[PDB]
Design an enzyme around this catalytic site. Structure first.
Site, mmCIF file in Angstrom:
data_model
loop_
_atom_site.group_PDB
_atom_site.id
_atom_site.type_symbol
_atom_site.label_atom_id
_atom_site.label_comp_id
_atom_site.label_asym_id
_atom_site.label_seq_id
_atom_site.Cartn_x
_atom_site.Cartn_y
_atom_site.Cartn_z
ATOM 1 N N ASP A 1 -6.897 24.174 3.777
ATOM 2 C CA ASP A 1 -6.917 23.055 4.418
ATOM 3 C C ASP A 1 -8.507 22.888 4.678
ATOM 4 O O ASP A 1 -9.322 22.356 5.666
ATOM 5 C CB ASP A 1 -6.116 22.696 5.111
ATOM 6 C CG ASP A 1 -6.306 21.199 5.595
ATOM 7 O OD1 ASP A 1 -6.931 20.321 4.556
ATOM 8 O OD2 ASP A 1 -5.911 20.564 6.218
ATOM 9 N N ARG B 1 -13.266 17.188 7.229
ATOM 10 C CA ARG B 1 -12.573 16.554 8.171
ATOM 11 C C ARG B 1 -12.103 17.522 9.570
ATOM 12 O O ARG B 1 -12.128 17.529 10.554
ATOM 13 C CB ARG B 1 -11.320 15.967 8.366
ATOM 14 C CG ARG B 1 -10.064 16.239 7.400
ATOM 15 C CD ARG B 1 -8.828 15.633 7.631
ATOM 16 N NE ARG B 1 -8.453 17.127 6.237
ATOM 17 C CZ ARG B 1 -8.107 16.663 5.304
ATOM 18 N NH1 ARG B 1 -8.746 15.865 4.405
ATOM 19 N NH2 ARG B 1 -7.400 17.524 4.380
ATOM 20 N N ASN B 2 -12.342 19.062 8.898
ATOM 21 C CA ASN B 2 -11.874 20.321 10.496
ATOM 22 C C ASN B 2 -12.369 21.489 10.297
ATOM 23 O O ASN B 2 -12.529 22.105 10.622
ATOM 24 C CB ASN B 2 -10.534 20.801 8.847
ATOM 25 C CG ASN B 2 -9.466 19.846 8.385
ATOM 26 O OD1 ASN B 2 -8.704 19.140 9.802
ATOM 27 N ND2 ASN B 2 -8.757 19.946 7.395
ATOM 28 N N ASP C 1 -10.024 23.224 12.706
ATOM 29 C CA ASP C 1 -8.634 22.713 12.795
ATOM 30 C C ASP C 1 -8.057 23.922 11.842
ATOM 31 O O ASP C 1 -8.208 24.476 10.507
ATOM 32 C CB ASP C 1 -8.502 21.999 12.049
ATOM 33 C CG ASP C 1 -6.967 21.421 12.248
ATOM 34 O OD1 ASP C 1 -6.160 21.360 11.251
ATOM 35 O OD2 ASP C 1 -6.422 20.674 12.727
HETATM 36 C C1 LIG Z 1 -7.725 20.965 18.282
HETATM 37 C C2 LIG Z 1 -9.600 21.139 18.436
HETATM 38 C C3 LIG Z 1 -11.090 20.557 19.147
HETATM 39 C C4 LIG Z 1 -11.680 21.263 19.146
HETATM 40 C C5 LIG Z 1 -13.069 20.062 19.221
HETATM 41 C C6 LIG Z 1 -13.523 18.709 19.507
HETATM 42 C C7 LIG Z 1 -15.179 18.806 19.867
HETATM 43 N N1 LIG Z 1 -15.279 17.818 20.327
HETATM 44 C C8 LIG Z 1 -15.329 16.566 19.855
HETATM 45 O O1 LIG Z 1 -13.992 16.172 19.318
HETATM 46 C C9 LIG Z 1 -16.374 15.588 19.675
HETATM 47 C C10 LIG Z 1 -15.685 14.292 19.074
HETATM 48 C C11 LIG Z 1 -16.968 13.217 19.233
HETATM 49 C C12 LIG Z 1 -18.012 13.243 19.992
HETATM 50 C C13 LIG Z 1 -18.398 12.445 19.883
HETATM 51 N N2 LIG Z 1 -20.054 12.264 19.404
HETATM 52 C C14 LIG Z 1 -21.377 11.019 19.357
HETATM 53 C C15 LIG Z 1 -22.042 10.990 18.319
HETATM 54 N N3 LIG Z 1 -21.613 11.139 17.055
HETATM 55 C C16 LIG Z 1 -22.419 11.530 16.239
HETATM 56 C C17 LIG Z 1 -21.326 13.018 17.715
HETATM 57 C C18 LIG Z 1 -20.433 13.776 18.771
HETATM 58 C C19 LIG Z 1 -18.496 14.340 20.319
HETATM 59 C C20 LIG Z 1 -17.417 15.903 20.826
HETATM 60 N N4 LIG Z 1 -15.450 19.978 20.213
HETATM 61 N N5 LIG Z 1 -14.569 21.553 20.263
HETATM 62 C C21 LIG Z 1 -11.974 22.641 18.409
HETATM 63 C C22 LIG Z 1 -11.260 23.061 17.444
HETATM 64 C C23 LIG Z 1 -9.605 22.602 18.160
HETATM 65 N N6 LIG Z 1 -8.421 23.361 17.215
#
Ligand SMILES: Cc1cc(-c2cc(NC(=O)c3ccc(CN4CCN(C)CC4)cc3)[nH]n2)ccc1N
Length: 303
Positions: free
Chosen positions: A157, A161-162, A178
């Site tokens: 996958d 998005r992942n 992901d």
């Molecule tokens: C389950 C899972 C989660 C993660 C994970 C997710 C994040 N980060 C964010 O979800 C995030 C979303 C939105 C933003 C905000 N934006 C605002 C403006 N953008 C341009 C960039 C970031 C920042 C971080 N870090 N690690 C990694 C691996 C796994 N399996």
């Protein structure tokens, strides 16, 4: 989770839940919800022993089935056993309190699809991104895919998005985050949820998966990258794409895409798996594009 206590094997080593690093719940503080729920219920968190460690916290809703619990555990095991800079780190877990947590490397740049869409060049931010930024993201993910290929792990996958970015600005590093599809497979959902637009012909016809099926997916990811976050095969449905690609149809180059980059895509999309490059070759060709001034001096389209 203890009643079934699944074992997980990667690179010849077998692990179980008991091998995950349990972080005491009292050391964990949630700061804010993160993102639009792509990766699930995810929070920015802090872990302390000060100068606390910043993390992403994936939670397991308490109102989930016992098999959702098992999926969650397996996801944690899978990501914990990877050891590569272009694969998101797992900091630890907090499974002995409810709701259960997985602690992950904080990727402040968010997911790659959203990043591409929100950081598109526009008249106000004319040079928000450049061709070299895109080639570096491509290299980053290809590097992670090569690591998976070398360790005989089929991701199944690979898609924008992942993938996630460490930070929005220059110096950003893209990583595979992901592993839900591979998780579901390792533990085997429905036909309408399959990543049809990222799957090669033999995935449908015979359901045969190899690392060359990730190569195909990576070709589609390249199109996502260089289109600046468009949906693959725009204006085609899943079944239309399935029929299109089986009959030999391929996407057109993204707007302004340099020929040498588009040719990596079309090589990734060779009908015959044996005619597709492995990720070492993909990396070589990405590097070559990176060295070519005519490639990297191509202007991205303005939105
Ligand atoms: C389950 C899972 C989660 C993660 C994970 C997710 C994040 N980060 C964010 O979800 C995030 C979303 C939105 C933003 C905000 N934006 C605002 C403006 N953008 C341009 C960039 C970031 C920042 C971080 N870090 N690690 C990694 C691996 C796994 N399996």
């Amino acid at each position: 989770m203890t009643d079934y206590n699944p074992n997980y094997s990667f690179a010849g080593k077998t692990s179980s839940i008991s091998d995950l690093k349990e972080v005491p719940r009292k050391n964990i503080t949630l700061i804010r919800g993160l993102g639009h729920g792509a990766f699930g219920e995810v929070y920015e968190g802090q872990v302390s022993g000060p100068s606390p460690l910043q993390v992403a916290v994936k939670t397991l809703p308490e109102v989930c089935s016992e098999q959702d619990e098992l999926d969650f555990l397996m996801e944690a095991l899978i990501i914990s056993k990877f050891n590569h800079q272009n694969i998101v780190r797992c900091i630890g877990v907090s499974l002995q309190s409810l709701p259960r947590f997985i602690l992950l490397e904080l990727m402040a740049g968010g997911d790659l699809k959203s990043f591409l869409r929100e950081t598109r060049p526009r008249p106000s931010q004319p040079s928000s991104l450049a061709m070299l930024d895109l080639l570096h993201v491509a290299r980053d993910i290809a590097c992670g895919c090569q690591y998976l290929e070398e360790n005989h792990f089929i991701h199944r996958d690979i898609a924008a998005r992942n993938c996630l970015l460490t930070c929005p600005g220059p110096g950003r590093v893209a990583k595979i985050g992901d592993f839900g599809m591979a998780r579901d497979i390792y533990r085997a959902g429905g036909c309408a949820m399959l990543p049809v637009k990222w799957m090669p012909p033999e995935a449908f016809m015979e359901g045969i998966f190899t690392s060359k099926t990730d190569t195909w997916s990576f070709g589609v990811l390249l199109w996502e990258i260089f289109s600046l976050g468009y949906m693959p095969y725009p204006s085609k449905s899943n079944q239309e794409v399935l029929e299109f690609v089986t009959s030999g149809g391929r996407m057109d180059p993204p707007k302004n895409c340099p020929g040498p980059v588009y040719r990596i895509m079309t090589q990734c999309w060779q009908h015959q798996p044996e005619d597709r490059p492995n990720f070492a070759i993909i990396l070589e060709r990405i590097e070559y594009c990176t060295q070519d001034p005519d490639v990297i001096n191509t202007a991205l389209p303005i939105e």
